[PDB]
Amino acid sequence: MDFTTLQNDFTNDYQKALIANNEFLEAKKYYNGNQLPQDVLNIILERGQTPIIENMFKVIVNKILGY
Amino acid sequence: MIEVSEVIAKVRERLNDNEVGNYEILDSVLVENINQALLKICLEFRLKKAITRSLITEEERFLTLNNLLGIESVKLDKKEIESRNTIEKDTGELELLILSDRISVTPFKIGELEVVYYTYEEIRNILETIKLPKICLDVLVYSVLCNLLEIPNNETNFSVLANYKQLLKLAKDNLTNYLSLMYSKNIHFSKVVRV
Numbered sequence: 631m632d633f634t635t636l637q638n639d640f641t642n643d644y645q646k647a648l649i650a651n652n653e654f655l656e657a658k659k660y661y662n663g664n665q666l667p668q669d670v671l672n673i674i675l676e677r678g679q680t681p682i683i684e685n686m687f688k689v690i691v692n693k694i695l696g697y
Numbered sequence: 698m699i700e701v702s703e704v705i706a707k708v709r710e711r712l713n714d715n716e717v718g719n720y721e722i723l724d725s726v727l728v729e730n731i732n733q734a735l736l737k738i739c740l741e742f743r744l745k746k747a748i749t750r751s752l753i754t755e756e757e758r759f760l761t762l763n764n765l766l767g768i769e770s771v772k773l774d775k776k777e778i779e780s781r782n783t784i785e786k787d788t789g790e791l792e793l794l795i796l797s798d799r800i801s802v803t804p805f806k807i808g809e810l811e812v813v814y815y816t817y818e819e820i821r822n823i824l825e826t827i828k829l830p831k832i833c834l835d836v837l838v839y840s841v842l843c844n845l846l847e848i849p850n851n852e853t854n855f856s857v858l859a860n861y862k863q864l865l866k867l868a869k870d871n872l873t874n875y876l877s878l879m880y881s882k883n884i885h886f887s888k889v890v891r892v
Binding site: 677678679680 | 886887888
């Protein structure tokens with residue numbers, strides 16, 4: 631009802647829901663093409679290779695959402 | 698840097714001619730043979746790269762190089778010169794004319810020449826010094842020594858020459874090792890073909 635318990639309960643709720651929000655943001659990044667990690671991208675780009683990303687589960691989600 | 702004295706001493710020892718008084722092989726012969734060895738060594742391994750950036754006009758048309766072995770890049774006003782010839786073509790594509798250690802441009806155009814080539818810096822005195830890596834010593838000996846073993850001093854000189862050929866091959870392997878360690882990239886993987 632004042633700022634103290636609001637800040638403390640927001641901290642307790644945000645810290646215990648960070649491990650799921652991080653996975654949510656990972657899932658939204660994987661849905662939008664960002665599927666390779668940084669070190670894998672560096673390993674691919676050091677060989678002069680173009681990184682090809684097959685977004686094979688975007689069409690799955692698009693099929694279920696199209697239903 | 699290699700002193701000529703140590704090459705000469707090793708060759709004299711190897712030829713059983715390490716006698717100050719006698720000198721069955723004259724030092725002129727040894728210095729000429731060492732020049733030949735420097736020729737072959739610098740040609741095969743492309744040891745010495747030199748860059749010359751001069752200007753050619755209608756007054757003087759040729760660029761006199763020295764101890765030429767090969768040309769690997771020619772620029773004329775920062776323009777690549779493509780073909781090489783020795784015939785003085787009248788007109789056509791722009792080619793590089795080579796006249797036995799004289800360089801010009803075939804369908805002549807006023808300008809400048811930036812040429813990369815290879816050189817000897819051959820020696821003429823026993824007290825001189827060969828500006829080469831010390832690892833090149835054994836390849837100088839074993840190569841000049843095969844040039845002298847085929848004087849018919851002995852009936853078994855050619856088998857000895859054959860042994861020295863294998864020794865020379867090993868020396869060249871060492872030299873290639875050195876050159877790769879110096880003037881080559883330190884890489885451990887290839888790059889993917891990009892087309």
